[PDB]
Amino acid sequence: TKRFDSEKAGDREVQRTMLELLNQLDGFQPNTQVKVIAATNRVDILDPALLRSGRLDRKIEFPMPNEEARARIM
Amino acid sequence: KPGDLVGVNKDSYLILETLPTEYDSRVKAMEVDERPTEQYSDIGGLDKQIQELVEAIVLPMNHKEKFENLGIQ
Amino acid sequence: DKSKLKPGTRVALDMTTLTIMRYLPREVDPLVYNMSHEDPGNVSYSEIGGL
Amino acid sequence: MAERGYSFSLTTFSPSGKLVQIEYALAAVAGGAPSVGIKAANGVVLATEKKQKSILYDERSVHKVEPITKHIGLVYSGMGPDYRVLVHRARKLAQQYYLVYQEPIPTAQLVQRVASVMQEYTQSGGVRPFGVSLLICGWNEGRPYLFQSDPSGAYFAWKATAMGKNYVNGKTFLEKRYNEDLELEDAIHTAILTLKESFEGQMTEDNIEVGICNEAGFRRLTPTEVRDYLAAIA
Amino acid sequence: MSSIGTGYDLSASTFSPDGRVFQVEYAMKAVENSSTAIGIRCKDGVVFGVEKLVLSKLYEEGSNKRLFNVDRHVGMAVAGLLADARSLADIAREEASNFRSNFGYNIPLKHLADRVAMYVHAYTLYSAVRPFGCSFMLGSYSVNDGAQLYMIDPSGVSYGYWGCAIGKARQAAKTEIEKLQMKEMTCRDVVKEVAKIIYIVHDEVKDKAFELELSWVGELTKGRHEIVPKDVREEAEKYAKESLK
Amino acid sequence: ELMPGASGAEVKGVCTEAGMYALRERRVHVTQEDFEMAVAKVMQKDSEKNMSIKKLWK
Amino acid sequence: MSRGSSAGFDRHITIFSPEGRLYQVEYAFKAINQGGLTSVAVRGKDCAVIVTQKKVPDKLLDSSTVTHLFKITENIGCVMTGMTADSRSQVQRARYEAANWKYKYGYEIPVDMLCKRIADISQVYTQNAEMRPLGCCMILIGIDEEQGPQVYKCDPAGYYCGFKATAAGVKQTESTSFLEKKVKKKFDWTFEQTVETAITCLSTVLSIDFKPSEIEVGVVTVENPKFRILTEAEIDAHLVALAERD
């Protein structure tokens, strides 16, 4: 996660690695044809640069289930 | 070209051989392992969602011609 | 030619008698060389447009 | 209100012997625009410079010099938001005192009364200690009064004091030029010198305001007069 | 958002570097998780429709009330978590109740939507009480504006709508409303149509059964707000099932 | 009396500065008048740091 | 770091900080940009005009209902700029304050006085740790009962001052700069000219040029004290006028 003003620690190997995904991810270096299946329980901790539509185009929800959905699993 | 591996002899620096460009050991782990089927019917409920994932992920790769016909990226 | 060899440029030397054997072109880094040579993706001017 | 609320104090002492938030507040008054207040002993003059820096302010009303009532005036230092409550507060107090005495609030008395409310704001929770310093002027009972009210609550009665940008330099000039019981002309002149000490808030007439208290009440001065006093200082 | 270990998402009298409280956003997910409430503005009245999920087969209509009658001309249709919906219902009822009794005329909605949203928002500001994780609509027939429908979000923002849906498939429902002209159409036809959108939303492979509560405030009832008459209610559901297939 | 100081550096600087004024002027001695100009220079530099809320390190 | 550092509990609630203001207070300024609205305020000498972007995020809205222009009194009109959640809430608070004067005084409240009562109100929010400051600012227009048309704006932290020209928005500093050159070069102010300055300045910085249903213009003229909504036809009229200036 980028948000650093860290002069006290905070590694910044980790800073490079999130930034690098964007780099690969811009159109200049192809990524049109390859899909990335991204998964997170918390999108409540991420930033918009990594997420946000048209960088990872489709955004698929899975809301809580209901009785029929319970019915088929059982 | 730049990025290519090439061998060179230690005892006197001549090019031993030419090798093609290749990934780290960690990356080899990252490559395919494959996962087995839960089958669409068999993975219980969430019906509207089976459609959303199938359409997005697997179809543009496998059922590619229909997408080319749509004209989308 | 004495003129070819300068502070900026590179030379190759005998490892066994250190006389300048020959001249080599300037300093370069392999990462730089590929970045300059290549231009993938291209990118259309039209898109950024309207702004 | 429609919630539980707070009541815990945001200030805790130190084994230093200090209260932490008032020291941060003191930094904010210094970050202001120069405001000086001198009691001459032939009237009280409060002068300030106001950073507008565009003169797209059609103020014929609110300013950094605002009259509280007809023989009290107020000038601040620091930030504007904290001023807004204090100026309204002072007007209310002016009204409370007007009803019984019917001579609007005296300066010695005003400060004690503001000081008590300021102290609560530190002492209590769901409120916070100011970071404005007020300079209060008044002429009432045939004596001029000048007080300075600190963002903690403290009040000191001064002959001449400075606040706002480069106050340390201001207070030191004030001691040298001004000595106690000099004339109304000296008080005004040094007052405008402190603003000139360091300006940088657009040099046009409407960017300095002075308001003067004297025997006949309090009025704020037109920006054009203020400029004439400045013009002398190079 | 952030998941800081002291405040910001753990308080709500604290704004983020950008100026937003993460706590209202977590609450905004809650309307999405359960069933939809649709409500469209007519000009002879307003027609509301909330699908009430048959969770238990031993319930009767009036259970897990998503439809409230705010006054005798004001409705409230909610979507999202029912506990925050109840609070919002209680305030709305008292605000509407004083206005008919005292003034003697029907309430213009636009002010009412602003006041209730003020209530939502005042609580967001506070860290001592919570943002409301419901989205709800208010609908009224007036003699100063005619029909009005306003939708207030879990953030306390009010906008007027010709036709709204808040729930687990906003995108599918809004679009169906766009295609149709119900904006100035007669309330009677609308009853059938609002039910039919509920039918698309509902799945027989994500839900078993629902019980339709629609509410009239329109020309049948002569502008009186009642929960849908049993005959009409059935007629409208009957059409909804028949027309898909 | 005139300097309020702030450092041993400030004290030391009054002397060094008097040499810089004498050199400019091309004196072959250091005069009493030079020290007067120097303190005053040094003083002024202190005041700039005082305004900024700084010690001797920025 | 800065703008997110503990020094008391001042990056959480209002108390001063190392920055010489308040962190919590500064998020409340930062908050204005998020809403996405930008406003230009010009003070005429026959009217006082505010133009602000009207946030339209659906195609299922009725035009009349969806606005940010509010009638505070039959003398004062306003636009809300910043976060819309905070906008509805401040307006309802103001309204009680306007009404409170209204019975006592027996006449329409001055634009200066309306701004003074609300400004102080925004200060209570700011002084308190019980609630966070408003994410919005209310910018007032009105005919002052002798001074003339007046434009006052109260901050989201609540301080108010008078203006010839004001701007608040996403880009607060740049709009204000564009706006001083329009004042300097003085075309003079009639009903149409002053409205025209105001819209163009909002268009030039952001570099859009609008539809009449995505800007809103609100005036208080000396035709009558009552505040009016001009509606799309008259707003369109002003848009076309902007061409081939000055």
mmCIF file of C-alpha atoms in Angstrom, chain D residues 57-217:
data_model
loop_
_atom_site.group_PDB
_atom_site.id
_atom_site.type_symbol
_atom_site.label_atom_id
_atom_site.label_comp_id
_atom_site.label_asym_id
_atom_site.label_seq_id
_atom_site.Cartn_x
_atom_site.Cartn_y
_atom_site.Cartn_z
ATOM 1 C CA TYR D 57 -12.715 41.981 -0.238
ATOM 2 C CA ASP D 58 -15.727 44.400 -0.340
ATOM 3 C CA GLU D 59 -15.600 44.701 3.475
ATOM 4 C CA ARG D 60 -17.312 47.777 4.772
ATOM 5 C CA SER D 61 -18.173 45.625 7.620
ATOM 6 C CA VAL D 62 -16.200 42.820 9.256
ATOM 7 C CA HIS D 63 -12.511 43.139 9.376
ATOM 8 C CA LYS D 64 -9.667 42.204 11.722
ATOM 9 C CA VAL D 65 -10.672 45.382 13.612
ATOM 10 C CA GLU D 66 -14.226 45.049 14.665
ATOM 11 C CA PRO D 67 -15.970 47.211 17.282
ATOM 12 C CA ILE D 68 -17.483 45.270 20.125
ATOM 13 C CA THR D 69 -19.502 48.184 21.291
ATOM 14 C CA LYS D 70 -19.077 51.989 21.040
ATOM 15 C CA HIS D 71 -15.917 52.416 23.215
ATOM 16 C CA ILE D 72 -14.494 48.840 23.072
ATOM 17 C CA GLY D 73 -12.742 47.447 20.109
ATOM 18 C CA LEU D 74 -10.964 44.234 19.239
ATOM 19 C CA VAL D 75 -8.089 43.194 17.164
ATOM 20 C CA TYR D 76 -6.815 39.525 17.057
ATOM 21 C CA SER D 77 -3.884 37.567 15.975
ATOM 22 C CA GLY D 78 -3.517 34.212 14.226
ATOM 23 C CA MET D 79 -6.379 32.553 12.483
ATOM 24 C CA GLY D 80 -9.764 33.817 11.596
ATOM 25 C CA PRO D 81 -12.129 30.979 12.668
ATOM 26 C CA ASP D 82 -11.316 31.237 16.396
ATOM 27 C CA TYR D 83 -11.789 35.024 16.139
ATOM 28 C CA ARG D 84 -15.317 34.625 14.951
ATOM 29 C CA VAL D 85 -16.691 33.100 18.083
ATOM 30 C CA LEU D 86 -14.604 35.575 20.349
ATOM 31 C CA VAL D 87 -15.903 38.686 18.599
ATOM 32 C CA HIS D 88 -19.507 37.445 18.910
ATOM 33 C CA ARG D 89 -18.836 36.531 22.509
ATOM 34 C CA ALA D 90 -17.502 39.902 23.374
ATOM 35 C CA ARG D 91 -20.575 41.598 21.806
ATOM 36 C CA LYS D 92 -22.825 39.475 24.016
ATOM 37 C CA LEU D 93 -20.868 40.430 27.068
ATOM 38 C CA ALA D 94 -21.035 44.024 26.047
ATOM 39 C CA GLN D 95 -24.858 43.572 26.032
ATOM 40 C CA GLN D 96 -25.014 41.914 29.413
ATOM 41 C CA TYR D 97 -23.038 44.808 31.050
ATOM 42 C CA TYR D 98 -25.062 47.406 29.013
ATOM 43 C CA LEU D 99 -28.253 46.357 30.614
ATOM 44 C CA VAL D 100 -27.239 46.917 34.293
ATOM 45 C CA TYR D 101 -24.503 49.679 34.053
ATOM 46 C CA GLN D 102 -25.674 51.127 30.729
ATOM 47 C CA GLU D 103 -22.131 52.243 30.155
ATOM 48 C CA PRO D 104 -20.707 49.439 27.948
ATOM 49 C CA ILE D 105 -18.197 46.882 29.418
ATOM 50 C CA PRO D 106 -14.951 48.193 30.974
ATOM 51 C CA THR D 107 -11.600 46.552 29.846
ATOM 52 C CA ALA D 108 -10.252 45.366 33.191
ATOM 53 C CA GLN D 109 -13.531 43.770 33.814
ATOM 54 C CA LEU D 110 -13.926 42.259 30.235
ATOM 55 C CA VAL D 111 -10.767 40.285 30.360
ATOM 56 C CA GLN D 112 -11.584 38.520 33.613
ATOM 57 C CA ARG D 113 -14.912 37.501 32.254
ATOM 58 C CA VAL D 114 -13.487 36.186 28.781
ATOM 59 C CA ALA D 115 -10.582 34.488 30.788
ATOM 60 C CA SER D 116 -12.887 32.439 32.834
ATOM 61 C CA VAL D 117 -14.640 31.002 29.652
ATOM 62 C CA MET D 118 -11.330 30.415 27.917
ATOM 63 C CA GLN D 119 -10.082 28.423 30.892
ATOM 64 C CA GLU D 120 -13.093 26.137 30.849
ATOM 65 C CA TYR D 121 -12.447 25.359 27.160
ATOM 66 C CA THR D 122 -9.067 23.888 28.112
ATOM 67 C CA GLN D 123 -10.178 22.367 31.320
ATOM 68 C CA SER D 124 -13.235 20.583 29.898
ATOM 69 C CA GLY D 125 -13.718 18.139 26.948
ATOM 70 C CA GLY D 126 -15.727 18.565 23.730
ATOM 71 C CA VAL D 127 -14.121 21.945 23.476
ATOM 72 C CA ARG D 128 -10.548 22.949 22.799
ATOM 73 C CA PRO D 129 -8.226 25.850 23.943
ATOM 74 C CA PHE D 130 -7.947 28.710 21.523
ATOM 75 C CA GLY D 131 -4.978 29.742 19.489
ATOM 76 C CA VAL D 132 -5.876 33.374 19.022
ATOM 77 C CA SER D 133 -4.501 36.321 21.097
ATOM 78 C CA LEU D 134 -6.799 39.177 21.602
ATOM 79 C CA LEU D 135 -5.762 42.817 22.157
ATOM 80 C CA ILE D 136 -8.547 44.732 23.926
ATOM 81 C CA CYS D 137 -8.741 48.521 23.999
ATOM 82 C CA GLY D 138 -11.130 50.738 25.759
ATOM 83 C CA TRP D 139 -11.509 54.234 27.040
ATOM 84 C CA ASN D 140 -13.962 54.387 29.851
ATOM 85 C CA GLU D 141 -13.944 56.224 33.279
ATOM 86 C CA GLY D 142 -11.407 58.857 31.888
ATOM 87 C CA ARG D 143 -8.593 56.275 31.555
ATOM 88 C CA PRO D 144 -7.362 54.323 28.463
ATOM 89 C CA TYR D 145 -6.851 50.533 28.985
ATOM 90 C CA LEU D 146 -4.876 48.022 26.934
ATOM 91 C CA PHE D 147 -4.850 44.358 27.904
ATOM 92 C CA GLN D 148 -3.669 41.264 26.140
ATOM 93 C CA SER D 149 -5.511 38.020 26.570
ATOM 94 C CA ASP D 150 -3.441 34.867 25.767
ATOM 95 C CA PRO D 151 -4.983 31.689 24.112
ATOM 96 C CA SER D 152 -4.770 29.924 27.590
ATOM 97 C CA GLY D 153 -6.931 32.395 29.435
ATOM 98 C CA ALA D 154 -4.263 34.471 31.033
ATOM 99 C CA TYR D 155 -4.602 38.243 31.048
ATOM 100 C CA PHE D 156 -1.727 40.792 31.413
ATOM 101 C CA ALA D 157 -2.150 44.637 31.341
ATOM 102 C CA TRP D 158 0.388 46.158 29.048
ATOM 103 C CA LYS D 159 1.552 49.597 28.037
ATOM 104 C CA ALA D 160 2.668 48.261 24.649
ATOM 105 C CA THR D 161 2.776 44.700 23.321
ATOM 106 C CA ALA D 162 3.027 42.872 20.131
ATOM 107 C CA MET D 163 1.765 39.722 18.565
ATOM 108 C CA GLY D 164 1.561 38.169 15.146
ATOM 109 C CA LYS D 165 4.439 37.675 12.771
ATOM 110 C CA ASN D 166 7.809 38.532 14.253
ATOM 111 C CA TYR D 167 6.548 39.553 17.688
ATOM 112 C CA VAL D 168 10.042 39.047 19.267
ATOM 113 C CA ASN D 169 11.471 41.845 17.195
ATOM 114 C CA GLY D 170 8.372 43.944 17.706
ATOM 115 C CA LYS D 171 8.429 43.909 21.574
ATOM 116 C CA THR D 172 12.166 44.796 21.543
ATOM 117 C CA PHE D 173 11.648 47.816 19.179
ATOM 118 C CA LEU D 174 8.675 48.778 21.373
ATOM 119 C CA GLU D 175 10.892 49.029 24.496
ATOM 120 C CA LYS D 176 13.487 51.209 22.757
ATOM 121 C CA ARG D 177 11.225 53.705 20.958
ATOM 122 C CA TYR D 178 8.330 53.637 23.264
ATOM 123 C CA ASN D 179 8.874 54.467 26.970
ATOM 124 C CA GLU D 180 6.067 54.807 29.384
ATOM 125 C CA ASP D 181 3.732 57.917 29.264
ATOM 126 C CA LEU D 182 4.799 59.207 25.842
ATOM 127 C CA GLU D 183 2.269 60.985 23.461
ATOM 128 C CA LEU D 184 -0.546 59.809 21.230
ATOM 129 C CA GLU D 185 1.643 60.631 18.173
ATOM 130 C CA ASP D 186 4.399 58.263 19.354
ATOM 131 C CA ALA D 187 1.990 55.394 20.040
ATOM 132 C CA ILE D 188 0.471 55.593 16.590
ATOM 133 C CA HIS D 189 3.896 55.869 14.763
ATOM 134 C CA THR D 190 5.652 52.892 16.370
ATOM 135 C CA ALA D 191 2.354 51.002 15.886
ATOM 136 C CA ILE D 192 2.471 51.358 12.180
ATOM 137 C CA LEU D 193 6.406 50.617 12.329
ATOM 138 C CA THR D 194 5.775 47.154 13.728
ATOM 139 C CA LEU D 195 3.528 46.326 10.841
ATOM 140 C CA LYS D 196 6.173 47.599 8.474
ATOM 141 C CA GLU D 197 8.817 45.507 10.312
ATOM 142 C CA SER D 198 7.777 42.706 8.003
ATOM 143 C CA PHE D 199 4.638 43.268 5.752
ATOM 144 C CA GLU D 200 4.023 40.924 2.741
ATOM 145 C CA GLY D 201 0.249 40.921 2.421
ATOM 146 C CA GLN D 202 -0.210 43.142 -0.696
ATOM 147 C CA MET D 203 0.627 46.810 -0.331
ATOM 148 C CA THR D 204 -2.615 48.638 -1.027
ATOM 149 C CA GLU D 205 -4.604 50.791 1.500
ATOM 150 C CA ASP D 206 -7.206 48.042 2.093
ATOM 151 C CA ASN D 207 -4.770 45.538 3.683
ATOM 152 C CA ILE D 208 -4.167 47.583 6.938
ATOM 153 C CA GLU D 209 -6.696 48.693 9.428
ATOM 154 C CA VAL D 210 -6.397 50.654 12.531
ATOM 155 C CA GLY D 211 -9.209 51.387 14.994
ATOM 156 C CA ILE D 212 -8.658 54.090 17.706
ATOM 157 C CA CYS D 213 -10.267 54.499 21.068
ATOM 158 C CA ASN D 214 -10.210 57.865 22.629
ATOM 159 C CA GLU D 215 -12.328 60.161 24.895
ATOM 160 C CA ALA D 216 -15.355 60.217 22.358
ATOM 161 C CA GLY D 217 -15.667 56.429 21.881
#
